[PDB]
């Protein structure tokens, strides 16, 4: 039953490859449905942002080597924006999956019960985030693409100097 979603990535407009995720819909269904729909764009316009609820053309705006890569801010591209398909944010659904390995997909937030559209992919274990961020999926292919994102040189806000853009995205 678990859905599979993908991003086709470019780095400074140069295709880097495809990342495929499996989403743990059995554990975190509301969280997974949000991400799935942001991949397809099927839910249309975000209520507060008035921009498409869609990861197409969205950046990975924050990268920290040996920690994680973060993206999904479709409205501002810098971490300040984003919103969920439900309007505004939604509650933390489950803390059952641990941040105990690389290549886990988890929600970025701005505190308790503030899940929007922003996510991160771990590149090392991040156990201190347990109870703070909801893990809801995992990379199943394209790990090397994630590593290439992780290796980008970044600015003072940890934003890559070279644009890491989701060219295309969807559900498999």
């Amino acid at each position: 039953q678990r859905p599979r979603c993908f991003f086709d990535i470019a780095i400074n407009n140069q295709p880097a490859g495809r990342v495929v995720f499996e989403l743990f819909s059995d554990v975190c269904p509301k969280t997974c449905e949000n991400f799935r729909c942001l991949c397809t764009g099927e839910k249309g316009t975000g209520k507060s942002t008035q921009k498409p609820l869609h990861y197409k053309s969205c950046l990975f705006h924050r990268v920290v080597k040996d920690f994680m890569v973060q993206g999904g801010d479709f409205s501002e591209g810098n971490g300040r924006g984003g919103e969920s398909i439900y309007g505004g944010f939604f509650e933390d659904e489950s803390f059952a999956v641990k941040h105990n390995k690389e290549f886990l997909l988890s929600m970025a937030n701005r505190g308790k019960d503030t899940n929007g559209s922003q996510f991160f992919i771990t590149t090392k274990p991040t156990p201190h985030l347990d109870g703070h961020h909801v893990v809801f999926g995992q990379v199943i292919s394209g790990q090397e693409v994630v590593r290439e994102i992780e290796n980008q040189k970044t600015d003072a806000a940890s934003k890559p100097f070279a644009e890491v853009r989701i060219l295309s995205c969807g559900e498999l």
Partner: peptide
């Protein structure tokens, strides 16, 4: 430090 926030990134 090592957080993943959306708006005020901390140490």
């Amino acid at each position: 430090x090592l957080l993943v926030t959306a708006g005020l990134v901390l140490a």
